[PDB]
Design a protein around this ligand. Structure first.
Ligand SMILES: [Ca+2]
Ligand SMILES: [Zn+2]
Length: 859
């Protein structure tokens, strides 16, 4: 039970103490033995000062055993040591030295020093994960972000292991089967960013050359030896170098650390983590099979997100976890800026509008919404009070702050902020003050308007035109923020006018005006006299966070000609408005389906050039069909969708990303006999689709679809697993087994996913990922009751990180009916953990919205 540090306790300890240095010695010599190895030696020497001689404090440590603790030469009594109370430090002097010898535990969870044994070759791999407060599982420390210090880490490790930390180091043979790795003393940094990766990782090396008073940066990439054949190091290094050329120019500050290593690590819960000089990534970013450009784009965005943190987060750190939203929102915004500015992903604002903004809007339009900023009174509150809306809306609203301040001004402000707070801590207010000084804006009201509120403003044009089609008047109308307190926010936004390009017949932007929009109505004098064209967007360039609506002529143009919009971003904003309208019972599901499917090679989603938009819109369509369409129309809708997607798959360029996307969308669809027959032929090779690479993972996707339709079963799944006898094959097999369309199979899947804790986590998740399928809704009816009866116990029995996939993934989102709402209502009258209630409330809210949309679809 590690401690639940409170904000006030952190403040008290930060007021009293200042830490200079940690010197850490880790004995990992036993670490390459079998699963019976539990502990490693951890010695820490801390030097720190106290503002009050004679005061008492405490230091943190989660250890199996504390052998010794000595403060200023006095042995401390560690006989009653408990991880929840750490080590008390009585009678402090002005200057202090503490030496602790302990045995700490390896973990197989999301916290501390994680240990994994590779079943392919028996290699043993370690990596640390410390955010928020798990550094205390590896060494003794004042584990809070505002007590920065330097770290000098020495490790003794098995001789065949590489060892990577925050700084570069020197390695010497001990002649005792081990090597000693002495890392340079780091620059001052927070404990949660200290890193250690160790094991027989494969290594690739490169360098980002010295560039305009930034020292050269040595670069490394690491992954498990068993994955190395599929790691595309050269592409990763290209993107990495593009980021390092971009960020020091945008931020006006050189890379603050000495080198940069990126490690793909096993069983990683956290996704990616910005440890200074030593970034960790999940292994799903090493692609064994063909994937579309969208996944490469996403991976590059993650790479640049963590790189942005080397400045914002690691050079200058939040004082307390209540600014975690800001840390993440900034890094996401910065990652996309860098994508557009320095990489091949020059359409990344299209992605951000299509994916992140949409994700934000989908959640924030529900009564279950909450603000971005939250009070964080202790560590536990980080894990419960920050979620999907926090991150996607946070990034979205930060993009708007950047617009309101002005991009050049925002970057100037960041330079001052980095200079002013380098090597120390800062808060949101410190940033806002920098931005105010860089722009002349007043930002005193911004937080209250944007970070402490819920809900969306609708923005739409109110226009009047003369006989020539020229505006005589033009206003932006803003609705009250809902669901929420109805404020009218202040935005910086752009209005774009679009009309036919005579040469091509595409819709191109003929006028753009940027302005501040405030209150209920804002006149736009710049547009008086301008030709209205065919389409008006009042959130052109996607600068603000809103519900954009169109005037009637513009809406008719969208419906008739969305695919003729030339640039990807306005076109994506039109897809997003249409989807938002469908979600909110303003556009019928069947009309959204018809817009997406189109009727020709040049209409609908089949004409869309951005693969990420294709993929996302196709997913939204599948959701519209299952959730939002009137049940009596759903079979017809699925027939139309499956038909059109087979046509598109067959018409697509051989070997193209578009081909593969259409095939993958089929694989998640309700399929008719014609499509089942074509898919079988693609899988077994009796009638292949020309150019389609039917590799290991595409075989699984096709087979899974066949299983779901009854066309393949246990024997075929077992045969497939025999040809892909790997960890990934095992997960794919489980998803296929869960898809078997029988009551016995669903019962077994539920039992294993919900009640078998011996299963690895990723096998549990895989099982869950095949439980639902849009063709099998009737098999799932009895699991509405099962879910609500069992989720409390699951939440109690599993950690909340182990419970969430089950709570989210088995929420009965399929059972769109008033009976389900009523079961959920009653559950919600009971006593339950708040984080659980939040998830259940959100799923309930989705069903209520769906019921409303179905009623609209049959109007
Ligand atoms: Ca964590
Ligand atoms: Zn981040």
């Amino acid at each position: 039970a590690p401690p639940n540090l409170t904000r006030e306790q952190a403040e008290q300890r930060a007021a009293l103490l200042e830490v200079q240095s940690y010197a850490i010695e880790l004995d990992l010599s036993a670490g390459a033995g079998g699963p019976e190895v539990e502990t490693f030696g951890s010695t820490t020497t801390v030097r720190f000062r106290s503002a009050t001689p004679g005061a008492e404090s405490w230091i943190d440590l989660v250890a199996a055993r504390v052998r010794s603790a000595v403060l200023n030469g006095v042995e401390l009594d560690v006989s009653d040591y408990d991880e929840s109370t750490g080590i008390r430090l009585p009678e402090l002097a002005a200057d202090n030295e503490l030496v602790v010898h302990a045995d700490c535990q390896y973990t197989n969870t999301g916290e501390g020093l994680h240990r994994f044994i590779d079943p392919v070759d028996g290699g043993v791999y370690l990596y640390s994960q410390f955010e928020t407060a798990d550094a205390k599982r590896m060494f003794t420390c004042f584990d809070q972000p505002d007590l920065k210090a330097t770290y000098q880490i020495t490790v003794t490790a098995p001789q065949d292991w590489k060892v990577i930390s925050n700084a570069a180091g020197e390695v010497t043979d001990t002649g005792e089967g081990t090597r000693r790795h002495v890392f340079d003393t780091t620059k001052p940094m927070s404990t949660y960013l200290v890193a250690l990766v160790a094991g027989p990782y494969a290594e690739w090396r490169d360098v980002f050359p010295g560039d305009d008073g930034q020292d050269e940066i040595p670069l490394g990439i690491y992954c498990r030896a068993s994955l190395a054949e599929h790691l595309d190091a050269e592409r990763l290094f290209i993107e990495t170098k593009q980021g390092f050329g971009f960020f020091h120019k945008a931020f006006g500050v050189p890379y603050p650390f000495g080198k940069y290593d990126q490690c793909f690590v096993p069983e990683f819960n956290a996704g990616a983590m910005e440890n200074a000089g030593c970034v960790t990534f999940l292994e799903d970013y090493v692609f064994r099979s063909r994937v579309t450009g969208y996944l490469y784009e996403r991976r590059s965005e993650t790479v640049l997100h963590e790189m942005a943190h080397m400045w914002f987060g690691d050079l200058v750190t939040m004082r307390w976890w209540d600014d975690l939203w800001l840390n993440e929102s900034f890094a996401t915004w910065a990652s996309v800026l860098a994508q557009v500015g320095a990489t091949q992903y020059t359409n990344a604002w299209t992605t951000f509008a299509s994916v992140e903004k949409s994700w934000a809007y989908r959640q924030d339009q529900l009564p279950s919404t909450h603000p971005v900023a939250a009070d964080i009174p202790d560590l536990q509150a980080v894990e419960v009070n920050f979620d999907g809306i926090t991150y996607a809306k946070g990034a979205s609203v930060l993009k708007q702050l950047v617009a309101y301040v002005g991009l050049e001004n925002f970057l100037a402000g960041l330079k001052v902020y980095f200079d002013r707070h380098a090597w120390g801590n800062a808060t949101l207010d410190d940033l806002l003050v920098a931005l105010e000084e860089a722009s002349g804006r007043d930002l005193s009201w911004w937080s209250a308007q944007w970070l402490q509120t819920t809900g969306l403003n609708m923005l739409r044009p109110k226009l009047a035109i003369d006989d020539e089609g020229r505006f005589t008047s033009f206003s932006v109308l803003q609705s009250p923020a809902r669901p929420g307190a109805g404020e009218h926010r202040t935005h910086r936004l752009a209005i774009g006018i679009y009309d036919d390009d005579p040469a091509t017949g595409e819709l191109v932007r003929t006028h753009r005006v940027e302005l501040d929009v405030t209150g209920e109505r804002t006149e736009v004098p710049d547009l008086v006299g301008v030709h209205r064209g065919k389409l008006v967007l009042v959130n052109d360039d996607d600068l603000t966070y809103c519900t954009m609506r169109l005037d009637p002529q513009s809406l008719a143009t969208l419906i008739d000609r969305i695919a003729d919009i030339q640039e990807s971003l306005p076109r994506a904003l039109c897809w997003s408005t249409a989807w938002e309208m469908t979600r909110e019972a303003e556009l019928k599901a069947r009309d959204f389906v018809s817009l997406v499917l189109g009727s020709s090679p040049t209409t609908g989603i089949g004409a869309e050039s951005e693969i990420g938009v294709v993929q996302r819109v196709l997913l939204q369509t599948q959701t519209a069909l299952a959730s939002y369409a009137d049940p009596a129309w759903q079979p017809e809708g699925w027939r139309r969708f499956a038909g059109r997607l087979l046509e598109l798959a067959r018409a697509a360029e051989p070997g193209s990303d578009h081909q593969l996307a259409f095939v993958n969308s089929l694989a998640g669809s309700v399929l008719g006999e014609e499509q089942i027959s074509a898919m079988r032929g693609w899988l077994d090779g009796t009638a292949p689709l020309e150019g389609l690479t039917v590799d290991t993972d595409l075989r699984w996707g096709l087979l899974q679809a066949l299983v779901a339709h009854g066309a393949a079963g246990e024997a075929e799944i077992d045969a497939e697993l025999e040809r892909d006898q790997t960890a990934t094959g095992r997960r794919r097999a489980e998803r296929a087994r869960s898809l078997i369309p029988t009551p016995e199979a669903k019962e077994k899947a539920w039992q294993r996913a919900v009640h078998d804790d011996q299963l690895p986590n990723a096998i549990s998740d895989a099982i869950i990922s095949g439980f639902q399928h849009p063709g099998q809704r009737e098999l799932l009816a009895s699991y509405v009751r099962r879910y609500f009866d069992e989720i409390d116990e699951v939440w109690h029995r599993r950690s909340s990180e182990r419970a969430q996939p089950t709570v989210i993934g088995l929420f009965p989102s399929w059972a769109v009916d008033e009976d389900t709402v009523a079961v959920a209502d009653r559950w919600l009258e009971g006593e339950h953990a708040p984080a659980l209630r939040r998830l259940v409330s959100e799923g309930r809210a989705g069903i209520v919205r769906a019921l409303a949309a179905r009623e609209f679809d049959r109007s």
